[PDB]
Amino acid sequence: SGFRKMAFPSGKVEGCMVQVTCGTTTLNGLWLDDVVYCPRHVICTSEDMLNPNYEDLLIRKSNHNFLVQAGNVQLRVIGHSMQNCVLKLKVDTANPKTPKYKFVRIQPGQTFSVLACYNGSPSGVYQCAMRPNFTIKGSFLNGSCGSVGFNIDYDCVSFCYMHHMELPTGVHAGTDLEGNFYGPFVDRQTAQAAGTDTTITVNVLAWLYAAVINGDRWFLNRFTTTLNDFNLVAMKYNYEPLTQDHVDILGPLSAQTGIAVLDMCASLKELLQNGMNGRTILGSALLEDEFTPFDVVRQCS
Amino acid sequence: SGFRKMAFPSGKVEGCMVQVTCGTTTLNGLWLDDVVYCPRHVICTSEDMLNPNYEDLLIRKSNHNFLVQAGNVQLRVIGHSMQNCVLKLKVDTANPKTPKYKFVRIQPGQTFSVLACYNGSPSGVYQCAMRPNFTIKGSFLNGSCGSVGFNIDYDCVSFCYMHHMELPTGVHAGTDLEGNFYGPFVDRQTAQAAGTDTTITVNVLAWLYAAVINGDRWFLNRFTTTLNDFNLVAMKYNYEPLTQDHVDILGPLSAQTGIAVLDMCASLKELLQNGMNGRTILGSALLEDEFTPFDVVRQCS
Numbered sequence: 331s332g333f334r335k336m337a338f339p340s341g342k343v344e345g346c347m348v349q350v351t352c353g354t355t356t357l358n359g360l361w362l363d364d365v366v367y368c369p370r371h372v373i374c375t376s377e378d379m380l381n382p383n384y385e386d387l388l389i390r391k392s393n394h395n396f397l398v399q400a401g402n403v404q405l406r407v408i409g410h411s412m413q414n415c416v417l418k419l420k421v422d423t424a425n426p427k428t429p430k431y432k433f434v435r436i437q438p439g440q441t442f443s444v445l446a447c448y449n450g451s452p453s454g455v456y457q458c459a460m461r462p463n464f465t466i467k468g469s470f471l472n473g474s475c476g477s478v479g480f481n482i483d484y485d486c487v488s489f490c491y492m493h494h495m496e497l498p499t500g501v502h503a504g505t506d507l508e509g510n511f512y513g514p515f516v517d518r519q520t521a522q523a524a525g526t527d528t529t530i531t532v533n534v535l536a537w538l539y540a541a542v543i544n545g546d547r548w549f550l551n552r553f554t555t556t557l558n559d560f561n562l563v564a565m566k567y568n569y570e571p572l573t574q575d576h577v578d579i580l581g582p583l584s585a586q587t588g589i590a591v592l593d594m595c596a597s598l599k600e601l602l603q604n605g606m607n608g609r610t611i612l613g614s615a616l617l618e619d620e621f622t623p624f625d626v627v628r629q630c631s
Numbered sequence: 632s633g634f635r636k637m638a639f640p641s642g643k644v645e646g647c648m649v650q651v652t653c654g655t656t657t658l659n660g661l662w663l664d665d666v667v668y669c670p671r672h673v674i675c676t677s678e679d680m681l682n683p684n685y686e687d688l689l690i691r692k693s694n695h696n697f698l699v700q701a702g703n704v705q706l707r708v709i710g711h712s713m714q715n716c717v718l719k720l721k722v723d724t725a726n727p728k729t730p731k732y733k734f735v736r737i738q739p740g741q742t743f744s745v746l747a748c749y750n751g752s753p754s755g756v757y758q759c760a761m762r763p764n765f766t767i768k769g770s771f772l773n774g775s776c777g778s779v780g781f782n783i784d785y786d787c788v789s790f791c792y793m794h795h796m797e798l799p800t801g802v803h804a805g806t807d808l809e810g811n812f813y814g815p816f817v818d819r820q821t822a823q824a825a826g827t828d829t830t831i832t833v834n835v836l837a838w839l840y841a842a843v844i845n846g847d848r849w850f851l852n853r854f855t856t857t858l859n860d861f862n863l864v865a866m867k868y869n870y871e872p873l874t875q876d877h878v879d880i881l882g883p884l885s886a887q888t889g890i891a892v893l894d895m896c897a898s899l900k901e902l903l904q905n906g907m908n909g910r911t912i913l914g915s916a917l918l919e920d921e922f923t924p925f926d927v928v929r930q931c932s
């Protein structure tokens with residue numbers, strides 16, 4: 331029993347974290363095989379960040395301008411290239427701790443573990459979700475750039491996020507490991523804002539199933555709804571539309587608890603229109619949307 | 632910016648997790664140097680879980696009855712001893728991945744990271760607190776016994792908890808790494824129940840300081856309180872008494888934000904009285920008590 335926001339064990343990723351220093355800027359790098367991946371804004375000075383031409387700033391650098399530190403050992407940079415918003419530093423030593431890995435781009439609603447790092451040293455691990463507005467509600471301070479998000483599947487680490495910046499509302503923006511930003515963001519010192527966010531409906535439903543599995547049933551009712559009527563309700567409360575794919579994905583949880591997905595939707599509709607009325611669900615007074623159907627199945631098995 | 636329930640990076644602990652098998656029972660062990668630590672209930676028979684005599688059960692065992700598995704390698708048991716509720720299996724190989732470590736016994740209110748494991752294989756990492764009633768609200772399924780709680784300080788792992796059992800209310804009970812249980816619990820299937828739980832007041836105050844550090848001040852008021860008046864109100868909401876030690880411990884956070892501890896106590900009294908009125912504090916509609924003053928200082932700017 332119990333239900334916690336659980337991250338993947340971070341050990342396979344801790345063995346890849348390095349410190350990257352270029353000029354006066356220090357941030358984190360991900361050392362996989364003989365390449366260190368880090369945000370390309372490490373080559374930006376105070377002046378550059380406003381209107382940077384990264385190709386022009388990179389051509390002025392030599393390999394020895396990038397100081398890479400793996401623990402107490404200096405890695406020798408023997409090459410450098412840019413791929414989108416990610417800088418790839420070729421090093422002379424392959425990481426002996428390189429796990430089996432893939433670079434994957436995740437969709438909004440999907441969750442992942444973040445290993446927050448400072449000066450190439452892992453500080454903490456937490457679970458978070460890619461918001462529908464493409465930001466993450468992370469916990470990062472100055473020096474956290476280059477920290478990564480990942481999932482683990484049968485000893486294979488799927489790297490999905492690299493931290494680049496904080497938006498004025500305190501939320502975070504970054505890229506996949508190929509340097510493509512999640513969201514309409516740029517790695518520039520310019521006016522940027524997170525768009526209006528929405529609640530990940532399939533995730534709230536998954537979490538309602540987790541509560542049922544753990545013995546919280548007060549929100550269940552005899553009622554059902556159509557998918558279209560539920561979506562007309564959901565759109566009114568800033569909830570993401572629920573598709574037939576989400577309904578199919580919730581199938582296993584529905585079969586285990588005996589509560590049809592549209593029956594759980596009528597419960598969610600009532601919770602949205604009435605509130606929780608002094609009661610809680612899995613120790614929360616808010617409807618939690620950062621657990622996917624897979625996260626619920628994984629933690630309950 | 633941001634504030635998350637953050638666990639320590641688990642890598643140093645993942646390299647210590649082994650599987651311990653005794654007869655038909657399989658659970659987790661903690662392999663440090665040439666010793667494997669695990670709950671002594673691994674020797675307990677299914678026919679007598681009510682009144683086991685562990686000394687009588689252990690004297691009937693030989694070293695070769697304990698099968699220890701580290702990854703895909705069998706460790707050879709060369710000695711065994713019981714220390715309180717933990718079994719210490721001397722093995723022929725020292726763990727090459729043994730981190731720098733200490734065994735620490737924590738007090739209620741303290742937090743730690745739990746690396747949930749099954750069959751000696753790490754499954755997830757989450758953050759917990761030792762409740763005032765000495766239980767932990769963990770997330771553990773069958774076979775999770777032997778999973779450990781820990782904190783990390785400058786590469787030193789402080790092991791503070793080993794999981795032993797789930798009480799009837801869904802909460803968890805375990806020992807420190809010397810085998811002494813936290814709370815009045817016993818490793819017997821006898822009528823045991825967690826005492827009435829209370830809110831960790833010093834932790835809620837620390838979390839209110841974290842909200843002020845992150846820019847939230849809506850909950851503050853023009854009032855102050857005496858420590859005694861605060862405690863008279865606190866007990867009425869099932870909050871733990873706030874001692875002068877807690878007030879002293881909150882000193883650094885008080886100095887950083889400019890809000891005196893008793894002024895923050897007046898804010899907490901008001902929040903208990905009025906609730907949140909549709910607002911959240913650090914993304915929560917409840918008053919969070921699983922962040923210590925030390926956790927807030929570690930994570931916040």
Ligand SMILES: *CCC(=O)N(c1ccc(C(C)(C)C)cc1)[C@@H](C(=O)NCCc1cccc(F)c1)c1cccnc1
Nearest residue numbers: 672675680771772773774776795796797818819820821
């Ligand atoms: C690792 C074994 C396990 O999964 N148990 C378990 C722990 C301890 C015992 C005894 C010491 C032999 C009684 C038996 C089984 C799960 C568990 O705690 N089940 C409930 C048994 C129980 C213990 C104490 C009081 C009581 F009333 C009943 C378990 C299940 C989920 C998470 N952790 C452990």
Ligand SMILES: [Cl-]
Nearest residue numbers: 736737738741
């Ligand atoms: Cl302590």
